[model samples]
Target: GQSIMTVRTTHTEVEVHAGGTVELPCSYQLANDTQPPVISWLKGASPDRSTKVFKGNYNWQGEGLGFVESDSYKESFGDFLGRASVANLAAPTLRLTHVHPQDGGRYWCQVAQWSIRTEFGLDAKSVVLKVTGHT
Candidate 1:
């Protein structure tokens, strides 16, 4: 069976085996704002999570202009920098590869709208990653 998609359950607890991958879902409809739109991934129960797995200056939801920027996908936390990727822009899902037991936890995603002046947050999008052993 697969995780069902809902406004609150779209990315709920996803179970996977070690050495596999799971895509954390995220999408805020990208309300056009004054500043550069951003998104971040965290492994925790709340947004103020210390270790932000991934944070970007731009959300790949509009014209493909931001994707080519150097500071696009900035500040990737250790281990995940190489084993994860943004599956799509408008959808902005995180695909974790080679998952291990340590990787099993509550993963949260927030879409932050930013600009030269301000930055805001999103409502929901969290997945409890359940990683089983390799067998």
Candidate 2:
């Protein structure tokens, strides 16, 4: 009776060297929904303990008028402030640059759906990242 939300990660585990670049793939699907949902990326041992690294919104129904303008945007926080990004808003993939040992951890891709009438749902997928010393 309610919309179904699905979060996905392209790889379960990813390994990269420090000072290198990596793309942490992620995407989502919402069944029976016509509005753009919120996208978030978090890092920690698990979702419950993780901190949000990135957030994106399509600005649906707001001043942006549902994804037709620059007002729809993304934000990166904390450790990922300067080196993290989501290039494709549709796929919501996270790209990391100049990675370090601290970047090695489980990253979760989360999707939140809303209808403004108390209709809300969420889903997430995790991917492990291993950062090795630079050669």
Candidate 3:
């Protein structure tokens, strides 16, 4: 008797020291047993995380920011080029590397189960990252 279709987050707040790494977690609650789920990671200066920096095979920016460039999820350009990654594709975990002072902010993990007939998805709890350090 409910439509609880959503992505559950393990932590609403994550703190990392300057020049360090941290993982923000998220999980999708199965709404249906149909098609596969489409997950994505989007982060920006805005608290709402409206920007879509990571989706499908399309990635932008962070080209010069400093990233491993090992896969589509890792690289350096937009704002978080080298300092961020989607971590695991099976599960939702945002990886922050080369942590710096301004490297901390809000993020969003969106999980969607959809097809040509219907679609369902939801955003997880607001991930607020607090960065602290001297390096």
Candidate 4:
């Protein structure tokens, strides 16, 4: 069997203001589909491992301070958190509002799902995000 997974972004770069809104679009392709994959936004500053800044789901569940829904695709940043959204079922978009200096980092939209036939398994994909400020 052929299992192929790929993640893509709408744009290579984004420009926003201090209190502006930016949309980080993402899409993925997988060999199989299971549950509504788990999406996350991560900052790759530390070499050891990237820090999780945001996660998308019916409920905001993460290690740091939890998140609260604002509007559609709009979320509040909780304890160094940022907003995110999953638009369409096929391609989900994450939006970040009230941009800040610390917001500048490598963000990734990941998808984690599972498949079951005679057993269970996992499938995932990730896209890179580059945030820039408008001088």
Candidate 5:
């Protein structure tokens, strides 16, 4: 009756103190999974201008085989390489550690749903990070 893929973000704008940790969270609900979805985190409002921070996918079998990072995902030229990480598999949340002022910007959580090795749908949600230097 109701089978539609959806993606949701926990916050549109998030503020974190510099040197602190923050999560850019996003959740997904697939219509009817013929295949596991691929989740990617990118910096900036547009993918064209954005930098791919992280990309990974979940195991179709079960929890025994967990999330696997994509080999194709490359490191960005920005300052987030060593400080950013994919914190959760099920939620596709990016955890930013040692947050810096340069981290302040827009981030997108893009989810790609597939069916029989083909992309069925793609959805994305973005959040703005405001890094504060004050305690």
Candidate 6:
């Protein structure tokens, strides 16, 4: 059997106050009996630079961005050295607690499903995040 899946982000253009929260929606599809997928959020700044903000799967053993350091996903984003939360599993929303000038950039959401066979594992998607002056 083969598993098929696709990942996508819902909001491309969004607006928020300087200190506000935003949610980015993501969805996917896969064949029946296939294992639950792992969801990841990434941000692309340019042609050569990108960063992983979130990573989670059905298996707790698998390593994610924040799961190892703390129990809360909120803290994981904090560990990004300067990044803040904009995504979570509970609400499936990316919440930016306090927006700063540096928070503006291109963001993306990715999901992967690990399965047997070398060809039947891993899937993902991405989106852009553009923040503007709060006016």
Instruction: Give me the candidate number with maximum lDDT.
Output: 2
Candidate ordering by TM-score (highest first): 2, 5, 1, 3, 6, 4
| Candidate 4 clash pair list | none
lDDT (CA) per prediction: 0.63, 0.80, 0.59, 0.52, 0.72, 0.52
Q: Which candidate is the best by TM-score?
A: 2
Considering TM-score, which of the candidate structures 1 and 4 is the better prediction for this target?
1
Q: Where in model 4 is the C-alpha error above 4 Å?
A: 1-3, 45-48, 57-77, 80-82, 114-135
TM-score, each model? Answer: 0.70, 0.85, 0.65, 0.59, 0.75, 0.64
Clashes of each: 1, 0, 16, 0, 0, 4
Number of clashing residue pairs, candidate 6: 4
Clashing pairs in 1: 35-115
Question: lDDT of candidate 5 vs native?
Answer: 0.72
Question: What TM-score does structure 4 among the candidates reach?
Answer: 0.59
**Residue-level lDDT tens digits of model 1 in 1-135:** 221222233657788888888777666554444345566788876767646787766435454444545436556678787887775533567788888778988877766545323332344477788887622
- Over 20-135, each residue of candidate 2 has an lDDT whose tens digit, in order, gives 89888888888777677888889987777999889887766654455643657789999899888888666888899989878998889887774434334678888888888631
Give the better candidate number (3 or 5) by TM-score: 5
**Which tens-of-lDDT digit does each residue in 1-135 have in candidate 5?**
333557899799889998899988889887865456777788886855898777766555554444454422333335677877775645777888898768888998888764423433777889888888642
- State which candidate, 3 or 4, has the greater TM-score: 3
CA lDDT for candidate 3: 0.59
lDDT of 2 at 123: 81
Residue 91 of candidate 5: its Cα lDDT? 76
**Candidate 4, poorest ten consecutive residues by summed lDDT:** 115-124
lDDT of 3 at 14: 90
Per-residue accuracy of model 3 over 1-135 as CA lDDT, tens digit each? 222346788898898888788888877665543334456566664425466545432223253532222434333246666566665554657777777786566777766543323433444455777887632
Worst 10 residues of 1 by lDDT: 1-10
What is the alpha-carbon RMSD of candidate 5 to the true structure?
4.5
Candidate 6 lDDT tens digits, 1-135: 667655555776566555565555666666643445555666675322667665555434333433332343333343343444434443344555566555566666655564434444545555554456732
